[model samples]
Target: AMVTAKKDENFSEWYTQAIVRSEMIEYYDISGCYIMRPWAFHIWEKVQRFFDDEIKKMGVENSYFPMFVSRHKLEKFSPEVAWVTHYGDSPLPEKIAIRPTSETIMYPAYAKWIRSHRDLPLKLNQWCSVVRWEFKQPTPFLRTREFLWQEGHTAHATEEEAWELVLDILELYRRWYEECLAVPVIKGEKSEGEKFAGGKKTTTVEAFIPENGRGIQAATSHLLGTNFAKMFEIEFEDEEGHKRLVHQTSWGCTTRSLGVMIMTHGDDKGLVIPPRVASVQVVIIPILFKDENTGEILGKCRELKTMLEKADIRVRIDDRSNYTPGWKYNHWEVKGVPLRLELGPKDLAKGTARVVRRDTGEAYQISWADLAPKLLELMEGIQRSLFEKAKARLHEGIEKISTFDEVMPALNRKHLVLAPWCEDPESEEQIKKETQKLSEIQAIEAGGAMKTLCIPFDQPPMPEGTKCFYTGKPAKRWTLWGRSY
Candidate 1:
């Protein structure tokens, strides 16, 4: 019955309650932290296993680094880069930071480990928790102060090697979101204002949410330029025996994608988990009443469960008599079980089972003879349908504009805005200030690391009094602006 709440109304509250009721995560005493409950844990295992297998094939070896960095080495990370930046509870001679991002902690080790060209293109990955101490609003799995994710940091002797890794990681991340989660993402560059604090260039797989008319970056891959390499003085000899600063890229996809899944596919009824990772794919509920006919239904339920198990399907049967069959349907539906198989005397007599799809709430009846194939078909259909729905929302939520007034539509609709730029830094600063980041700023750049990277689209020339949008002088570049999380 709780699934009756409309997703268009109070989405945040609805999501918070759904996650708890669906048994995915538990709120922690720590303000911005959450505990992954049993079902969510199971889902993450599927994600990690799939991602790890694919990345490992790309010659990326997994490694673990110490969670702490020395204050001397850590100072290189700014407040945004440091987990302990606030020093809220206590102070020390030199505050040491928790691992906000391991670039600082791991690069030093890489510098010591890499010695020659043979060690070039050294690819290392780590699965660990990172601390950011969310100072703003907290959303479970999305904005938690601490979260689990895999971070891959690589050092290359040449730009070519670094370049290959960047695209490789981006595509691989996209495949994970698409194939494993059955969600689509847009690959693009982040605006200058929104790039990682210490990153030279930021690229992201942005996923859109329709309920709020906004986009969330499902993951990020950054080209650090020579920032961390220079900070750590990491250099290696080339085949020609010349020592050069290594180019670096680090990419990560967090459990936050879990939130994206919950938000994107979840309906007003509840979450609509993709069958691929749904811990419970098919829930078989036996409807028993005065109809002693439930015996054949029970027998058929056992047979169907056995066949699905043999076919390696993650199937479950609800036999608890304490609850009514209709109530059990609502319970598993809220949890987003991909499909529900209800068997009753009536259906048993007809030699068919009613399958309820989690996503569309549409029902299909199939013969026990064709049950397996039919179940798989419905699961795949649900997956593709949800992806298309999400893709539509992404393209719709992005409003392209050439002038400041044109931005009102995006702001009024609460959508992300893309705009033109013809200004210098001083001018950029003014526009950012005026908009209060209901519009943000970003520059243009190639697909690699640089001081800054611009938005991915072209824009019209400046109108009168534009004055570089900031400096009141001549302008030089085009950029974008949006309110971001």
Candidate 2:
């Protein structure tokens, strides 16, 4: 059956149906965990290859570490672990726990590895899964308890070098979202309360949701100025024989990005994958006349597939004889293949085939010899089109406000509110509490929640004596507030 849920009318159900229908993921027996089918894995691998190469160029080397760590080591992650040690302990005399993150596990080695200034900048990354065991609602790629991600940890000689890496990594993430995934994001810093615990500051790329006015933190880079070095004693001797703690940093991106891409570009019909990251960029479907040119149709399709593959395009021929051409079109359309080619007896005689786009549903004819260049142009055009649409949506979703009265309505109406605010914990708390109350009433019908998205780095002008939206006190900076995942 075709998807009955509309993107605007039934978002949750529509998202679930779209992912399942597109063959991106399958529900596993375990709740909060999922199985990545080849359809999704292909995109994942493409992203991995791109990111792996980029980080390597920046001097990051790949490595692997244990999935489990000592209980004492695990407790050093975040401060709340003392209150609730959720990662179950092991049976051995020295207790061990599953790694929620590699900081504790990897840092002890960092301490052991670096002895002097010669070992100053040690950068390493690993692609693996970590268990939080804290998620309640399990949304497929968005909130799964166990998901695939890459974590990069680096130790630098000075605080300045470490801070530079933090910004550099943030730009890389922004590029991934915009250039590769075709999703636009707002580069920014997190508030003190919302910043990653045990770090100096957290940098992020915040993406907006036009459908709901929610903001998703696409990725984060943290500057760990001597925090880990102090905790793990990761110190080194300077060139002058003086002992100094190494500056550290940690950053990561996860499969949650796929969820953002889905929400950003998908339509009521199904997924609209960006051409750059699409696994099968094009699928050729040959329409065979039941009256018996079936063999000829199959032969033409095979020829086209070879020509496209030789040009370095990912192509697939849906030449399954049992299914009709209409069925194949629906199947690939639902799967979000970027381009579709249809050929039949008439096209065979004309020496041309019809091309269809999944994004715009536009169809046109292209001659056989001109196929490669035409398809290449169309794919790049579709990729740019998707990014422009997302950029427009992001630009229109943000609203600047000045008063506490305006904050509630702006948030209630699903517009991301940018208001001047003092960056204090108490002010943040009051703003959050009041916004929640305003959001709770509207959320009853809208079906989502609200919070402060981030303190945007590309901030707008805040004139002197400007007041905080939640308080009459003088403001510190402008902050982005909205509903989020």
Candidate 3:
């Protein structure tokens, strides 16, 4: 069935219906756990392929660590950690906790392996699932209890080397979001209060959903400095024969990215997958009619599909005789295939096929001889178009404000306010509290309380004598503030 909820009127319901009806995710028996259907898993595979190759080129090697953690090895204690206390029906002598993150699991091995400066830059990444028993309302891809992600951990001899790799990995994340997903993001540094608890500094890519006027941390790269190294004793002997604690870094991008992309581009019809990351970039559907040359149309579609495959385009033919062409269109549209090709008897006679773009619903006809190149060209255009459209919306949704008084109105208008902040943690907390109070009074959703998204690396000229939006102190930097996932 087509989505009943209007995207603008009821985004939450629309998102659920769009993902479920599209067959991307199925609710699992366990709360906060979802089955990633091929429709969704294939998209994740696309992300993995791109990211894995990029990180490998940067000297990162893939490795795996056991998910089980001993109670003694665990450094951080959180109520959200899932514990395995029993084996079958018998209670265990000691409880084991599932990994919330692999830092604890991987660093001990690093401590054992690194003995000299040669192993100073130990870079490894693992693709796995982590369990965090989130108590909040679980949103499928965004806040699942167990979610798949790739975590890259690296140790460097110097802080400079660690910092350099931090930004480098951050750029790769930016490309993953912008180039592959066609979502625009702002590259920035997390505020002190928002930075990773154990890391020296945190860098992030922030993506916004214009629909909800919310900012999401797309991915994060953190410079751990010597904190974790000292704790885990991941030290190395330098060239000068001095023992030094390795400056380390940890970064990750999760399934939450899929949610951000869906939220950013999905519409009333269904998902609008970007071409680069779409599982099947082009789906060929034959248009059949009674007493028509059905065989000829199907043959043409198969031939085109073969040609596209040879050209390195992901293509599929939907020639099911049971369903109508309109039905097939809706099925594929809900799944967010980037392009659709329809060949009927008339089109076969004219040696042409009707091409339709999912992003814009723009349809045109192309000759069989030019189909492969034309489809590639069209897909490229769709990718570029989606990115540009999102970039425009991102720019449009940012409101520059000088005072806290303007924050609520801007948020009401679906804008993320870019305001000068005092860079004080207390002020940041007060901002959140004040917004929470106002949102309650205004009957806004609890998630509507504004928080600092990030202090973007790209800054507007902040003249001296500027006062902070809430504290009236000397403003330090412009922070992007919004209600987030």
Candidate 4:
């Protein structure tokens, strides 16, 4: 009885409004912060666990760094404070700002502890929340002032060593997206203006958000390039008996990912959650008949739950008697559980159960014979189905546009731009202001990823006369353009 607007027509409004309707999030008095209902918060824990496994391989331990930062101390980290404010309840010796990122607080401790080369590669991951104080059009997870995330900061003895962790984490990030989230993402390098303000080169996981086609920098690995190490003075003695600056980087997966997952495959009915991380992986409803016939149905449902739990599957049976079977159907559907098993006397008599796929909303009977194997097949099918649907939409949106007239129209459409950029950083900066103020410049890298997610109608190649797409100068390097929040 809510969110009747089609996703295609009012994507932004539809996305925010529907999420709350599905009980995924609740908008609170604070504009950027959201109240994560227990249902939605459980999904977050699933994603956090997926990213944690990747960092553990490199001996990266999770630790908590301080969140409060002074104005002077924050400047020492990034020198860019466009969004952060001097925050405190009462005036004091100095105002403390919430963490925009924790690099400043953590690296100083690294310097204090690592004086010997034995601690050459110091790695740590944190599952704590971060604050950015976003002031733009704020949505639940997509745009928020304060949100939960795991930001990993690592340091290495050599440049190559640091870059290795950066690449390793990016690969792990892609895998998490594919396996756990059931989403396909394009890995690429961000353009100059698009790269993180103080980062060397921001390697990004680019995914085309639905409908409008604009590329979203879903996740990023930044090569610190001695920027923070030099400021924080993080150095260790080398085998050659000299002290060298440690190279560093930070990579992150945010709650914003959850928002993207919903927007990509979430329908008017509700969200499309992957099987592995679903809070309630299975929802069994007792099909009680006139005789309060829920006895057999309840018994079978409990039996099935125990069986799946033994199989290490997270399962929950909704046995709230106040709610009817039809009401339970809408409840679970809105939250997007991966599988729903229905129990009734007929199914029990036949030694079978009725199973439904949340992805396609298709239902059929599963031989009560081997429920585990049946559930696994259904979950795998839903995962692939959601991934293919999102991948196809990404292909449909990215285009190549070059003419002066094409620029504004493409910006309005919100498609990623991939025309000849002259590869000049200056040209990219200029168009960044005019082209939705969200642009990135790149020297033709191996991935050609810069060209993949930019906005427009279709795509084109460098066919000469490719003067600075912005300044009209002889081209330097290709670049990508778009609008981003």
**Candidate topping TM-score:** 3
Show the lowest summed lDDT stretch of 10 residues, model 1: 443-452
What are the Cα lDDT values of the candidates? 0.76, 0.86, 0.92, 0.74
- For 96-139, candidate 2 gives per-residue lDDT tens digits of 66667899899999999999999979999999987766536788
- Cα RMSD for candidates in order: 6.1, 2.7, 1.6, 5.8
Model 1 deviation from the true structure expressed as Cα RMSD, one decimal place: 6.1
TM-scores for every predicted model: 0.87, 0.95, 0.98, 0.87
Q: In candidate 3, what are the lDDT values of residues 302-363, reduced to their tens digit?
A: 88999899889999899998999999999999889999999888888898889999988999
- Model 1 scores a C-alpha lDDT of 0.76
lDDT for position 164 in model 2:
98
**Candidate 4 or 3, higher TM-score:** 3
Tell me the RMSD of model 3 versus the true structure: 1.6
Q: What is candidate 4's lDDT per residue for 1-485, written digit by digit as tens?
A: 45666788888777766688788887688776789887778878887776777678678889988777777877662332333343355446665777877877788898898786888788888887777654566778877777788889888887888888888998888887777787777777776656777778788776667566566767888898788878888888977789988888899888888877778877777776888778888888888776756776788899888888887777888888887888888888878888888888888889888888888879988886688887887787888888888777766555566654676556556566666655556655555555433232222221312232322212245566667666677754445555554
Which candidate tops lDDT? Answer: 3
Model 3 stretches with alpha carbons more than 4 Å out: 444-447
Question: Which has the better TM-score: candidate 2, or candidate 3?
Answer: 3
lDDT of 1 by residue, 1-485 (tens): 56555788988888887798898998778888899998888988999998899888989999999887777876662554444444566666566778887877888788898878788788999999988865677889988888999999988877767877887888888888887787777777766666786768787787666676555678888887777888788898978988888888999999998888888888877888898898888999999886477667677899999988876778888988789987998888889888999898878889889988877768888998899888888888888887887777766776766556765456557566655455344445555566654333322221101111245423456565443333435444454445444
